């Protein structure tokens, strides 16, 4: 992190705000108590309304968490969790399984190297294609398969090596890559 | 406000009355307002490297002082466009002027303000939400290939006071207003960035993924990585421009910036002619590769002082698309031309030269330009990962790699695809010299090879061993002849000839060898190395016996199999599927095994 | 030779400046 | 079959164990680095608190007009001696203008006597210094291209950065490992 | 138009080499043209190479000899150098400075065009794809030219580069199975070369469509710096305004490069390799890059600079930078010439960068690329076999080496060797290539895919 | 597998214990530094302010009339 | 201490590359430190390169981009560059200018030491006779390093000189018949190299004893002029005052020499060879000669510069003038690297001038000197035999020549070759040397006295 002090602390403030926004989006109901307590030291600056300048001063003074490496790791964990939830949006996941997925993500050494990240990337390929895809036979088939996959992932979660989920991933991705003609 | 031209010695102007003009500030010299940049500042006079031809400029001509550095407009509308050295859209110039030339001092906008872009804001963002530099606050549907992420300018931050609703917005309409310390900043989709300042990133992660070119010798023997720095020294006609264009066409980079810094203009025209026809499949739909390619053209006869700007503009554009999470690849068509432009401007400044006339700061400039390449953890709140793979061709004068530009480049670039003039004359393209070339990313890529192409690393090692042994045996044979060669030495020589003529060299202008997927690059090598292993096993294990198998016996018995190995290259990745190619290579391996068994 | 010629020219210019 | 499968499994397990040991070593190094830097930052914060206390003490001292007049005379004369110009300007705080006027009145004759050089010193009644500044003056030459900043904000910094070795030795004790001071 | 009277200065501060220096110049204009009336009435011309305050460094084209300090009068034209161009320039002979030397009148200008021209907007530049049938087998077969290509003739002193260029002129035509206006600039060519080219263009009925710019060996050295540009400017007018197809031939670019070196040495500009200026690449590019087709205009400019490699060194700065700039090169070889092989074109160091797109199916024939690549490979291997035979002798060559040597002999005797007036079609060249390739068995032709071999080899 | 799990548990426990230990050591060092600075705050501050207030205007030694 | 207020000048008179020439300066002080506040508030620092009356040619470390006359405020500190030094500088990362880049606080100075250093009286400089067991048999065996020596690593682009330096850093230790504190000065090292070294130090647990000075490629190029001196100053403080056995690594003296050349060319000084300043020898000596031990002290400063030889040319001015100063050189070969040997140390051109007094009985062993001499002799003869074989062929080689070739092969396979994480004690290196010498008969080991051959050969 060879950022200038001003840029570094602005980035710290941004990371705190992004963690707050991710927490609000994933669990607007505050049901994910465990995760919110885990992120109390960063969510306090958003639950209690502070101006950008106040949080920046706190970060410079050391009161705020001002370690971009740790903040980036935590923000990535929460970002991947929110990505999983959103890509599963219609089929809401159970709170216990959400906590299990969060714990597994926290344990993982490097999430961008995690198989969880790759699985989420595949699911996002499918969902992003389906967002705009017109109702052609390929698009209807992909929509059905993606709905079934989303339900299965909501039931189980992407941390496991579920063979059903893996095979559905393979077939859906192959159909997506296959030509429209 | 206004300086006055004082003298003109070529690309270098002098200007009086510029007391407070900053170094590397951008000024407009002359009545036509030719763009220029201050490079030295003595007394109250400045000296300006003018990015346009200064012919006709008279002493006393106004020199407007724009209190800004040479900067690029970054925003939707870059992809598919061809700009000049100072980012003027050449297509827009042609449409506006209806002339086949580039008028001197034309001041057309870098990004069109008339197009209505489809802008969708980030869903989470709201009024009163803390946002900072590099944060993606919207996505613009630029085209089918590129979702142009709209990001806060670096060095910008504050609380959001207005985020535009989704809809059609032009590059001039305000899209995001925020406030910091009370001062309010309004932001459209376009951000202006100085080209000479590195765009910040949270971290520069190690390079760990190959930049799969279409060439076998580059993919296998001398891999490059996404985020690495490469050089392609070679005399004229060796094929470094063709390597750059083949990497531009067939590679795993989400964006490609071609910089044409000081090379032919017919090459840029050829790029524009070919790329729109070329296509890649995204989600089963064919989409042109020009939808992700951006050209920054400054041909050899265009103003010399612009070449430097070209390079910088290029890299800045790359950095912009690196910060979105795209794996950009910047092809510096010839950094030797940039070095020559620096040498000319230095000569006009009467500076003391370094080796062979180049300025004393050439190495520093090249190092600072190449240092902008690494894979990065992009700035901003959404965690991303971009890259800028700089592939910079070098043009050593006289084909001598002792050239100061080449020597300075090899001390920076981690991959060295040195091209040989002799191999080019034999039409052994790509002309890469497998002996001197090297890639310092092989140890960083074995982690990926062992899990995706587990069988490839030993094949690469054995192929390099074969080539080195053949080099030694050729040094011996040139003076002594093949009469005294050991039989295993003959097999080494012949399999090395097979590898050279039928694996390394790859005709890039054919339907089958334009792109060589890595499954092909590894299958062909596997078959040739297997043939080497079997021939060596037979010869070594029958040396003691009376039925001495030699190279001649193998060649007579295995003429058909040798021709099949030679023609392995002709397999068509598209006309013949991957499964068909793999099955045919397996069948050739079976034929080799059966023929060797029937021989022994 | 080029470096020495350049140095000689600069020395001449400096001498003129002092005069 | 047992031999090869076992060999592969031991390879996998041992490689993972080496990775775990490397991760433990890296985590240890990062932890110790963070601890060291945290202690150093605490020390720097304590020294900055000392400097802020010194700033507050100077801001108190300036209010004592009898002391501040002598200090201001010293500062103005010091700036004049540093400049040695024929025509100088003095920027001062608006409320400190009478004191700076008296200081310049005292300094001009002493300046002439000490430097044998006639001088014209004018107090800048147009562009005063910011009123938040603790005190002191700023002496510019005739054309204002050369300035000497004899503000307390500047003098404290100048002396403190030079004194830092002594402050470190006093506040946080001396170093035992430093055998030779030469 | 410029109506204000032009100022005449007798204030010549100093003279040094080819650089007059004028003082008290009122608002000097860089690159402005100046007319010097010497003391004896001799009218020379110069170009302002630099301006500084009231000083203007004027580069005299005819040389500074005889220039006086108090009596020379320099009138400033008020404008940069501009050539008067008209379509009547076709069929005329001018000296290196554009003044007629055929006893005709001056050019009644259709336009006044900047001598330096302008770089063509790369977005509007069209990529050459129309193959020219030069009739030379070594060019059509393996270095095919495209209409709108910069393809210089690399040669040496005494080699038949003039003959080859004249042949290309007299038998250059599209492979459509219309005339090529010719613009011929010559820099420092002996009288014999100029007479040869003029008499060759006159012998053929082409002199109507030929415009000559001649700067012989005894003519001013600095003027050679403008002889190409004039010519190219004319070509541009004939191509991008009159829609002609203009073949531009710049003879002895070595002389132009040496004149440029002389001027740079006079200016003490930063030298490159072997004393040439550090910007010789940029200047040679300004010359060469004035070629190719253009969008929306049915004209073209085909450049064939003829340059003498000093000491037959293809790495010399002139040929090296020319190869870096141009789109190929035709390498005239001394070894072939001494053997009396005409044209002595060594295809191995030759190259044509637009051949890849000017050949194939449609244009010419569909085996063109494969035949050319295989001929290159077999020729290179034959040369390698010759090199090895020089050491190991005849008896140590295998049967394949004998095949390659036979191919090399019959290739240099039947493909390269050609009559000075023999116009082989591209199909005849390809048939000769195939008859040579049939020396080897199919398996030894590893460049040609089996699909092409099965169809073309048997016949 | 079970041996690997036991090793991981031991590593995690040791890491937690030692992170707590180093946090305590850092706190102890900071407290000792505070205690050592409180004793010499007044003396150093007095010396520093005395040096600041003692102006002693002076001319550059090289100045010659 | 300096109590007089500093003088701030808005009188910048010129900017030229890295130089900022000021005028109207009151009694300029040569080598004085200046603080340039740019118009936008950016604060840079520079050093007065020369003074002439009221002028001062400042040299800005961060570069002159953005500086303008009439608005840049250069405040003259009134003193030479005195860097702050403290024992807690170990385990810290600073940029080329000494400022923290590890997110720690600025250095709380234990003292302020001139970066130029204090010259040490030769009468009281101890001769280093303690061997450093780097664990690399190519260095320990034949080019041994003595604690307090200056011995660079000559290499080129693409060779593993960084890996060798890291191996020496993590394996350096005294011979067993006090752990090293590493001070690192990176000049022009790309991000990959700096990250490699930092990760190597963290992984090996030595970071508590490592002080890094990083001046990456993107960083200013005039800053690396002070980066080594800073490092060495810290080393001196740790070595001659804190009594620590320091090991100073200077990554690229080639980049430092390029910075020197940049400043020299900006100053328009009379150049040396290849444009480098005529005083490069003295500037390099002021850096190298800061190693060694001194009387009364217990610490030392082992110095291991690293050079990237341009074009692999050991006669280039940088490696040439580094050989003239430093006591030996470790030479990384491109041929050995191409042949996949590691370390690619070519023992023929490399030497250690303090090896003779560091090896022998009591220090390492009786046979060390003789074994090294005989290995070098056999290696040289084997290289000559290989050169002869390449011309005349192996069938013309005698039995002894085949023995020499076998020794060369097994020497590059067993002695030079070595795992990156394998540290061979000096005794293991000597045992390998003897196993290789046993290839020859005792009658061919001419450089080993019989008293040692009878004791070590027969085993
Ligand atoms: N991969 C390739 N396949 C076929 N031909 C090639 C290849 N690479 C280069 N060439 C040939 O080399 C010639 C020179 O190409 P180019 O790279 O444009 O020259 P330069 O070396 O000056 O950049 C071209 O005419 C082309 O035919």
Residue closest by Cα to atom 15 of ligand 1: B239
Nearest residue to G277 (alpha-carbon basis) of G52, G21, G49: G49
CA–CA gap between residue E139 and residue E169 (Å, rounded): 13
CA–CA gap between residue A57 and residue F23 (Å, rounded): 25
The per-residue b/e assignment along D146-162, b for 16 or more CB within 10 angstroms, e otherwise, is bbbbbbbbbbbebbbeb
CA–CA gap between residue E221 and residue E47 (Å, rounded): 14
Q: Vertex B158, ends B152 and B162: CA angle to 5°?
A: 75
Select from G4, G102, G296 the Cβ nearest to the Cβ of D78: G4
Q: Which helix (H) or strand (E) holds G422?
A: none
- For residue G63, which phi and psi values (nearest 5 degrees)? 95, 155
Check pocket membership of B430 for ligand 1, CB cut-off 6 A: yes
Residue of C nearest to E265 (CA): C2
Candidates A2, A8, A10, A74, partner chain B, best to mutate (most B CBs within 10 A): A10
Residue of D nearest to A109 (CA): D23
- Counted across chains C and E, CB pairs separated by less than 8 A come out at 5
Q: Quick one: tokens of B329?
A: 């690849």
C-alpha torsion E350→E356→E361→E363, nearest 10: -70
Number of CB atoms found within 10 A of residue E364's CB: 22
Residues of D in Cβ contact (< 8 Å) with G107: none
Residues of G in Cβ contact (< 8 Å) with F51: 3
What is the C-alpha end-to-end distance of chain A, expressed in Å? 48
Experimental method: cryo-EM
C-alpha distances in Å from residue B335, one per residue of A48, B312, B341, B414, G445: 54, 11, 10, 16, 54
Check pocket membership of B213 for ligand 1, CB cut-off 6 A: no
Number of CB atoms found within 10 A of residue E329's CB: 27
CA–CA gap between residue E99 and residue E44 (Å, rounded): 13
CA–CA gap between residue E82 and residue E229 (Å, rounded): 10
CA–CA gap between residue B322 and residue B378 (Å, rounded): 7
Three-state SS string across chain A, please? CCCCHHHHHHHHHHHHHHHHHHHHHHCCCCCCHHHHHHCHHHHHHHHCCCCHHHHHHHHHHCCCCCCHHHHHHHHHHHHHHHHHHHHCCCCCCCHHHHHHHHHHHHHCCCHHHCHHHHHHHHHHHHHHHHHHCCCCHHHHHHHHHHHHHHHHHHHHCCCCCCHHHHHHHHHHHHHHHCCCC
Alpha helices (runs of H) in G295-419, residue ranges in sequence order: 317-325, 334-338, 368-392, 399-410
CA–CA gap between residue B246 and residue B213 (Å, rounded): 7
Helical axes D65-83 vs D2-63, angle rounded to 10°: 110
Pairing label, strands E73-80, B62-69 = unpaired
Those chains having 3 or more beta-carbon pairs within 8 angstroms of chain A are B, D
Tally DSSP H helices, then E strands, for chain B: 16, 26
Asked if E417 contacts E341 with a C-beta cutoff of 8 angstroms, the reply is yes
Residues of E in Cβ contact (< 8 Å) with C2: 270-271
DSSP G202-241: HHTT-GGGEEEEEEETTS-TTGGGTHHHHHHHHHHIIIII
Residues in chain C whose C lies over 2.5 Å from the next residue's N (breaks after): none
Asked if G342 contacts G160 with a C-beta cutoff of 8 angstroms, the reply is yes
Instruction: Kindly report whether the peptide bond that precedes residue E343 is cis, defined as omega within 30 degrees of 0.
Output: yes
Check pocket membership of B80 for ligand 1, CB cut-off 6 A: no
Check pocket membership of B236 for ligand 1, CB cut-off 6 A: yes
**Strand (E) positions, B197-306?**
229-233, 255-258, 279-282, 285-288, 293-296
**Strand (E) positions, E232-299?**
245-251, 293-294
CA–CA gap between residue E81 and residue E46 (Å, rounded): 10
DSSP B473-516: HHHHHHHH-STT--HHHHHHHHHHHHHIIIII---TTSTTTS--
Pairing label, strands B82-83, B293-296 = parallel
Pairing label, strands G19-22, G55-60 = antiparallel
CA–CA gap between residue G74 and residue G11 (Å, rounded): 8
CA–CA gap between residue E326 and residue B236 (Å, rounded): 10
Number of CB atoms found within 10 A of residue F47's CB: 15
Asked if E359 contacts E129 with a C-beta cutoff of 8 angstroms, the reply is no
- For residue B67, which phi and psi values (nearest 5 degrees)? -75, 50
Residue of B nearest to E51 (CA): B7
Nearest residue to G429 (alpha-carbon basis) of G131, G134, G141: G141
CA–CA gap between residue E33 and residue E75 (Å, rounded): 9
Q: Do C2 and B352 touch (CB under 8 A)?
A: no
**How close does chain B come to A136, measured CA to CA in Å?**
13
Q: Quick one: tokens of B209?
A: 């993924």
CA–CA gap between residue D111 and residue D81 (Å, rounded): 7
Asked if B267 contacts B260 with a C-beta cutoff of 8 angstroms, the reply is yes
The CATH class of G1-459 is alpha beta
Which residue's structure tokens are 């490496």? Answer: A69
Residues in CB range of E349: below 8 A, 6 or more apart: B425, E154, E314, E329, E331, E333
**Strand (E) positions, G97-221?**
111-114, 131-132, 145-146, 153-155, 181-189, 210-216
Residues in chain E whose C lies over 2.5 Å from the next residue's N (breaks after): 177
Q: Do G268 and C3 touch (CB under 8 A)?
A: no
Check pocket membership of E273 for ligand 1, CB cut-off 6 A: no
E108 vs C: CB within 8 A: no
Task: From B242, B274, B432, give the residue whose CB has the most ligand 1 atoms within 8 Å, as the site to mutate.
Answer: B242
CA–CA gap between residue E84 and residue E69 (Å, rounded): 31
Residue of F nearest to D112 (CA): F65
Residue closest by Cα to atom 1 of ligand 1: B508
Q: Which helix (H) or strand (E) holds B235?
A: none
Per DSSP, E414 falls in state I
Helix (H, G, I), strand (E, B) or coil at B186: strand
CA–CA gap between residue B274 and residue B269 (Å, rounded): 9
Per DSSP, E81 falls in state -
- For residue E350, which phi and psi values (nearest 5 degrees)? -85, 165
Nearest residue to B317 (alpha-carbon basis) of B195, B472, B474: B195
Nearest residue to B192 (alpha-carbon basis) of B51, B321, B316: B316
Q: Do A62 and D41 touch (CB under 8 A)?
A: yes
Residues in CB range of D19: below 8 A, 6 or more apart: none
Asked if G227 contacts G221 with a C-beta cutoff of 8 angstroms, the reply is no
Chain B residues whose C-beta is within 8 A of a chain A C-beta are 123-125, 129-135, 154-155, 157-159, 180-181, 200, 202-203, 281, 283-285, 377, 379-383, 385
Task: For residue D45, report the distance from its CA to the centre of ligand 1, in Å.
Answer: 63
Q: Which helix (H) or strand (E) holds B551?
A: helix B551-557
Integer Rg of chain D from CA: 30
**Strand (E) positions, E115-218?**
125-126, 131-132, 145-146, 153-155, 181-189, 210-216
- For residue D36, which phi and psi values (nearest 5 degrees)? -60, -50
Which C residues 1-19 touch E at CB under 8 Å? Answer: 2, 5-6, 9
Q: What atom in ligand 1 is closest to the CA of residue B235?
A: 21
CA–CA gap between residue B442 and residue G190 (Å, rounded): 18
Task: From B217, B239, B504, give the residue whose CB has the most ligand 1 atoms within 8 Å, as the site to mutate.
Answer: B239
**How close does chain B come to A146, measured CA to CA in Å?**
15
Half-sphere exposure of G50 (CA within 13 A, CB side): 8
C-alpha distances in Å from residue D138, one per residue of B448, D51, G426: 65, 22, 67
Half-sphere exposure of E123 (CA within 13 A, CB side): 22
- For residue A82, which phi and psi values (nearest 5 degrees)? -65, -35
**Residue B329 bridge partners (DSSP):** B256, B389
Half-sphere exposure of B529 (CA within 13 A, CB side): 19
Q: Vertex B143, ends B142 and B146: CA angle to 5°?
A: 80
Nearest residue to B159 (alpha-carbon basis) of B188, B182, B189: B182
Long-range contacts of A30-37 (CB under 8 A, 24+ apart): A31/A95, A32/A95, A32/A98, A32/A99, A32/A102, A34/A99, A34/A102, A35/A78, A35/A81, A35/A99, A35/A102
Check pocket membership of B523 for ligand 1, CB cut-off 6 A: no
DSSP B248-271: HHSSS-SEEEE--BTS-HHHHHHH
CA–CA gap between residue E405 and residue E323 (Å, rounded): 30
Number of CB atoms found within 10 A of residue A25's CB: 14
Per DSSP, B523 falls in state H
* Helix %, strand %, coil % of chain E (to 5): 35, 25, 40
Q: Do F56 and G27 touch (CB under 8 A)?
A: no
CA–CA gap between residue B350 and residue B372 (Å, rounded): 30
Asked if G128 contacts G303 with a C-beta cutoff of 8 angstroms, the reply is no
Q: Is the torsion defined by CA of F38, F40, F43, F47 positive or negative? A: negative
Instruction: Kindly report whether the peptide bond that precedes residue G343 is cis, defined as omega within 30 degrees of 0.
Output: yes
CA–CA gap between residue B486 and residue B556 (Å, rounded): 19
Check pocket membership of B508 for ligand 1, CB cut-off 6 A: yes
Check pocket membership of B240 for ligand 1, CB cut-off 6 A: yes
Which G residues 76-135 touch D at CB under 8 Å? Answer: 84, 86-88, 91, 102-106, 108-112
CA–CA gap between residue E365 and residue G410 (Å, rounded): 59
Per DSSP, E269 falls in state P
For chain G, the domains span 1-459
The per-residue b/e assignment along F8-31, b for 16 or more CB within 10 angstroms, e otherwise, is eeeeeeeeeeeeeebeeebeebbe
CA B432 to chain centre: 16
Check pocket membership of B244 for ligand 1, CB cut-off 6 A: no
Number of CB atoms found within 10 A of residue B277's CB: 9
Task: From B423, B424, B429, B513, give the residue whose CB has the most ligand 1 atoms within 8 Å, as the site to mutate.
Answer: B429
Candidates E52, E264, E268, E277, partner chain C, best to mutate (most C CBs within 10 A): E268
Q: Do G271 and C10 touch (CB under 8 A)?
A: no
Q: Quick one: tokens of E308?
A: 């003498």
Q: Vertex G160, ends G154 and G161: CA angle to 5°?
A: 35
Three-state SS string across E320-373, please? HHHHHHCCEEEEECHHHHHCCCCCCECCCCCEECCHHHHCCCCCCCCCHHHHHH
Which residue's structure tokens are 């036509």? Answer: B32
Nearest residue to G70 (alpha-carbon basis) of G6, G7, G14, G5: G14
> Is B224 among the annotated ligand-binding positions?
no
The length of chain G in residues reads 459
Residues in CB range of G140: below 8 A, 6 or more apart: G131, G133, G134, G424, G426, G429
Asked if G270 contacts G322 with a C-beta cutoff of 8 angstroms, the reply is no
Residues of F in Cβ contact (< 8 Å) with D114: 59
**Strand (E) positions, E39-100?**
43-52, 55-60, 73-80, 82-85, 92-95
Which residue's structure tokens are 């990362």? Answer: G93
Q: Do F45 and D32 touch (CB under 8 A)?
A: no
Q: What atom in ligand 1 is closest to the CA of residue B424?
A: 12
Helix (H, G, I), strand (E, B) or coil at G119: coil
Select from B130, B200, B385 the Cβ nearest to the Cβ of A14: B130
Select from B299, B340, B483 the Cβ nearest to the Cβ of E122: B299
Nearest residue to A71 (alpha-carbon basis) of E436, B186, B314, B383: B383
Check pocket membership of B399 for ligand 1, CB cut-off 6 A: no
Q: Which helix (H) or strand (E) holds B131?
A: strand B130-131
Select from E30, E124, E447 the Cβ nearest to the Cβ of B54: E30
Candidates G1, G4, G5, partner chain D, best to mutate (most D CBs within 10 A): G5
Nearest residue to E375 (alpha-carbon basis) of E428, E306, E432, E455: E432
**Residue G128, Ramachandran bin (φ over 0: left; ψ between -120 and 50: alpha; else beta):** beta
CA–CA gap between residue B496 and residue B471 (Å, rounded): 9
Select from B59, B91, B344 the Cβ nearest to the Cβ of E53: B59
Asked if B97 contacts E124 with a C-beta cutoff of 8 angstroms, the reply is no
Number of CB atoms found within 10 A of residue D11's CB: 10
Q: Quick one: tokens of E338?
A: 């001494």
Asked if B94 contacts B166 with a C-beta cutoff of 8 angstroms, the reply is no
Residue of E nearest to C3 (CA): E270
C-alpha distances in Å from residue G183, one per residue of D182, E163, G177, G244, G301: 20, 71, 27, 11, 10
Which residue's structure tokens are 């041996």? Answer: F3
Residue closest by Cα to atom 14 of ligand 1: B237
CA–CA gap between residue G138 and residue G416 (Å, rounded): 5
Q: Which helix (H) or strand (E) holds B531?
A: helix B518-541
Asked if G234 contacts G183 with a C-beta cutoff of 8 angstroms, the reply is yes
The per-residue b/e assignment along D101-117, b for 16 or more CB within 10 angstroms, e otherwise, is bebbebbbeebeebeee
C-alpha distances in Å from residue A20, one per residue of A11, A62, A117: 14, 19, 21
Number of CB atoms found within 10 A of residue G245's CB: 22
CA–CA gap between residue E273 and residue D16 (Å, rounded): 58
Per DSSP, E297 falls in state B
């Amino acid at each position: 992190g060879g950022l200038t002090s001003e840029q570094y602390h602005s980035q710290v403030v941004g990371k705190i705000g992004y963690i707050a926004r991710c927490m609000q989006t994933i669990d607007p109901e505050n049901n994910l108590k465990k995760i919110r307590e885990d992120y109390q030291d960063v969510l306090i600056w958003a639950e209690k309304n502070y101006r950008f300048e106040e949080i920046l001063e706190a970060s410079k003074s050391g009161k705020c968490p001002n370690d971009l490496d740790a903040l980036s790791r935590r923000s990535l964990i929460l970002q991947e969790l929110l990505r999983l939830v959103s890509s599963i949006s219609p089929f809401k996941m159970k709170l216990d399984l959400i906590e299990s997925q969060y714990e597994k993500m926290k344990q993982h050494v490097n999430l961008w190297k995690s198989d969880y990240h790759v699985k989420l990337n595949q699911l996002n390929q499918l969902t992003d294609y389906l967002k705009n895809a017109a109702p052609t036979p390929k698009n209807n088939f992909l929509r059905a398969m993606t709905s079934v996959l989303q339900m299965q992932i909501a039931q189980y979660g992407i941390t496991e090596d579920n063979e059903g989920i893996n095979q559905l991933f393979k077939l859906g991705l192959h159909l997506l890559a296959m030509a429209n003609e | 406000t206004f300086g006055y031209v004082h003298g003109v010695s070529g690309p270098v102007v002098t200007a009086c009355d510029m007391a407070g003009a900053a170094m590397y500030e951008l000024v407009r010299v002359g009545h036509s307002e030719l763009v220029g940049e201050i490079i030295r500042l003595e007394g109250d006079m400045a000296t300006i490297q003018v990015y346009e031809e200064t012919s006709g400029v008279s002493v006393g001509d106004p020199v407007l002082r724009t209190g800004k550095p040479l900067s690029v407009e970054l925003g939707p509308g870059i992809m598919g466009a061809i700009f000049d050295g100072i980012q003027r859209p050449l297509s827009d110039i042609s449409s506006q002027t209806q002339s086949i030339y580039i008028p001197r001092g034309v001041n057309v906008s870098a990004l069109s303000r008339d197009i209505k872009w489809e802008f969708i804001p980030s869903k989470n963002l709201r009024v009163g939400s803390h946002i900072t530099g590099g944060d993606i606050y919207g996505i613009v549907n630029e085209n089918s290939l590129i979702k142009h992420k709209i990001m806060l300018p670096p060095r910008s931050r504050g609380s959001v006071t207005y985020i535009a609703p989704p809809g059609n917005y032009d590059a001039s309409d305000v899209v995001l207003e925020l406030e910091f310390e009370g001062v309010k900043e309004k932001l459209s989709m376009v951000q202006v960035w100085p080209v000479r300042q590195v765009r910040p990133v949270t971290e520069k992660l190690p390079a760990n993924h190959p930049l799969l070119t279409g060439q076998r010798v580059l993919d296998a023997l001398f891999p490059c990585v996404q985020g690495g720095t490469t050089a392609i020294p070679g005399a004229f006609g060796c094929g470094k421009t063709v390597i750059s264009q083949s990497l531009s066409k067939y590679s795993n980079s989400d964006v490609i910036i071609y910089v044409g810094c000081g090379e032919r203009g017919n090459e840029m025209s050829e790029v524009l002619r070919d790329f729109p026809e070329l296509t890649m499949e995204v989600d089963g739909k064919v989409e042109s590769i020009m939808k992700r390619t951006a050209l920054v053209a400054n041909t050899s006869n265009m103003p010399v002082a612009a070449r430097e700007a070209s390079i910088y503009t290029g890299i800045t554009l790359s950095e912009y698309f690196r910060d979105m999470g795209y794996h950009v690849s910047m092809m510096a068509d010839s950094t030797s031309r940039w070095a020559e432009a620096l040498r000319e401007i230095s000569g006009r400044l009467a500076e003391m030269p370094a080796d062979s006339g180049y300025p004393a700061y050439l190495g520093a400039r090249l190092a600072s330009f190449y240092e902008r390449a690494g894979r990065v953890k992009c700035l901003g709140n959404p965690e991303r990962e971009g890259s800028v793979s700089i592939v910079g061709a070098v043009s050593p004068p006289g084909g001598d790699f002792s050239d100061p530009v080449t020597s300075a480049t090899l001390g920076i670039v981690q991959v060295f695809w040195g091209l040989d003039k002799k191999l080019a004359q034999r039409k052994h393209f790509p002309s890469v010299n497998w002996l001197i070339s090297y890639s310092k990313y092989m140890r960083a890529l074995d982690e990926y090879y062992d899990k995706h192409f587990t069988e490839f690393v030993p094949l690469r090692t054995k192929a390099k061993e074969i080539l080195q042994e053949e080099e030694d045996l050729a040094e011996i044979v040139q003076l002594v002849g093949k009469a005294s060669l050991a039989e295993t030495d003959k097999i080494t020589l012949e399999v090395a000839k097979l590898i050279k003529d039928d694996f390394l060299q790859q005709n890039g202008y054919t339907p089958y060898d334009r792109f060589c997927p890595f499954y092909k690059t590894v299958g062909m090598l596997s078959n040739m190395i297997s043939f080497y292993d079997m021939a060596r096993r037979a010869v070594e294990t029958t040396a003691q016996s009376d039925n001495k198998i030699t190279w001649s016996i193998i060649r007579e018995h295995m003429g058909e199999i040798l021709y099949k190995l030679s023609s392995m290259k002709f397999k068509d990745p598209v006309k013949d599927g991957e499964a068909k190619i793999k099955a045919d290579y397996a069948q050739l391996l079976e034929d080799m095994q059966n023929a060797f068994r029937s021989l022994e | 030779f080029y470096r020495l010629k350049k140095i000689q020219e600069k020395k001449k210019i400096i001498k003129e400046k002092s005069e | 079959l047992v031999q090869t499968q076992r060999l592969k499994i031991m390879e996998y397990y041992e490689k993972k164990e080496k990775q775990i040991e490397q991760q433990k070593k890296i985590q240890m190094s990062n932890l110790m680095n963070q601890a060291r830097l945290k202690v150093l930052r605490a020390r720097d914060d304590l020294i900055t608190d000392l400097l802020n206390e010194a700033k507050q003490r100077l801001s108190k001292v300036v209010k004592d007009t009898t002391r501040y007049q002598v200090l201001l005379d010293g500062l103005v004369l010091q700036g004049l001696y540093q400049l040695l110009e024929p025509r100088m300007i003095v920027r001062c705080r608006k409320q400190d203008f009478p004191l700076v006027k008296a200081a310049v009145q005292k300094a001009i004759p002493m300046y002439k006597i000490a430097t044998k050089k006639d001088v014209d010193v004018q107090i800048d009644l147009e562009a005063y210094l910011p009123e938040d500044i603790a005190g002191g003056v700023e002496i510019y030459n005739g054309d204002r291209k050369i300035k000497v900043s004899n503000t307390l904000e500047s003098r404290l910094d100048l002396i403190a950065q030079q004194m830092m070795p002594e402050v470190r030795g006093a506040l946080f004790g001396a170093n035992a490992n430093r055998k030779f001071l030469d | 138009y410029l109506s204000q009277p032009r100022l005449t200065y007798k204030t010549v501060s100093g003279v040094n080499g080819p650089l007059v220096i004028l003082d008290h110049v009122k608002f000097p204009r860089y690159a402005e043209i100046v007319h010097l009336t010497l003391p004896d009435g001799t009218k020379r011309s110069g170009q302002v190479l630099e301006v500084s305050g009231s000083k203007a460094v004027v580069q005299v084209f005819e040389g500074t000899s005889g220039i006086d300090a108090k009596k020379t009068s320099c009138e400033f034209t008020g404008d940069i150098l501009r050539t008067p161009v008209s379509e009547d320039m076709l069929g005329r002979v001018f000296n290196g400075s554009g003044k007629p030397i055929d006893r005709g009148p001056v050019v009644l200008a259709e336009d006044f065009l900047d001598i330096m021209g302008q770089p063509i907007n790369p977005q509007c530049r069209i990529y050459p794809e129309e193959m020219i049938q030069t009739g030379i087998s070594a060019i059509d077969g393996m270095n095919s030219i495209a209409r709108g290509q910069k393809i210089p003739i690399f040669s040496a002193a005494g080699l038949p580069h003039n003959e080859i260029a004249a042949q290309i002129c007299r038998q250059a035509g599209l492979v459509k199975k219309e005339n090529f206006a010719i613009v011929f600039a010559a820099m420092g060519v002996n009288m014999e070369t100029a007479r040869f080219f003029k008499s060759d263009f006159e012998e053929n009925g082409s002199m109507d469509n030929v415009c000559l710019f001649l700067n012989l060996a005894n003519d001013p050295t600095i003027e050679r710096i403008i002889t190409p540009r004039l010519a190219l400017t004319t070509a541009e007018f004939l191509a991008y305004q009159c829609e002609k197809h203009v073949l531009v031939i710049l003879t002895d670019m070595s002389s132009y490069a040496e004149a440029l070196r002389e001027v740079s040495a006079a200016r003490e500009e930063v030298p490159g390799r072997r004393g040439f200026p550090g910007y010789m690449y940029t200047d040679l590019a300004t010359i060469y890059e004035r070629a190719g087709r253009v969008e929306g205009r049915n004209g073209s400019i085909t450049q064939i600079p003829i340059l003498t490699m000093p000491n037959d060194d293809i790495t010399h700065p002139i040929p090296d930078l020319t190869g870096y700039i141009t789109e190929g090169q035709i390498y005239v070889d001394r070894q072939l010439h001494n053997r009396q092989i005409y044209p002595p074109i060594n295809v191995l160091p030759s190259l044509s960068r637009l051949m890849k797109s000017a050949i194939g199916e449609g244009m010419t024939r569909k085996d063109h690329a494969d035949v050319s690549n295989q001929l290159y490979a077999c020729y290179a291997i034959g040369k390698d076999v010759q090199a090895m035979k020089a050491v190991v002798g005849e008896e140590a060559l295998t049967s394949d080496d004998l095949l390659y040597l036979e191919f090399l002999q019959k290739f240099e005797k039947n493909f390269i060797t050609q009559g000075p007036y023999e116009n082989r079609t591209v199909y005849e060249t390809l048939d000769i290539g195939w008859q040579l390739l049939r020396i080897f068995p199919k398996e030894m032709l590893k460049r040609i895919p089996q699909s092409t071999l099965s169809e073309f080899y048997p016949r | 597998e079970q041996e690997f799990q036991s090793k991981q548990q031991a590593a995690m426990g040791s890491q937690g214990n030692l992170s707590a230990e180093v946090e305590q050591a850092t706190r102890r060092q900071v407290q000792g530094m505070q205690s050592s600075q409180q004793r010499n705050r007044e003396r150093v501050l007095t010396q520093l302010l005395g040096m600041v207030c003692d102006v002693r205007p002076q001319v550059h030694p090289n100045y010659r009339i």
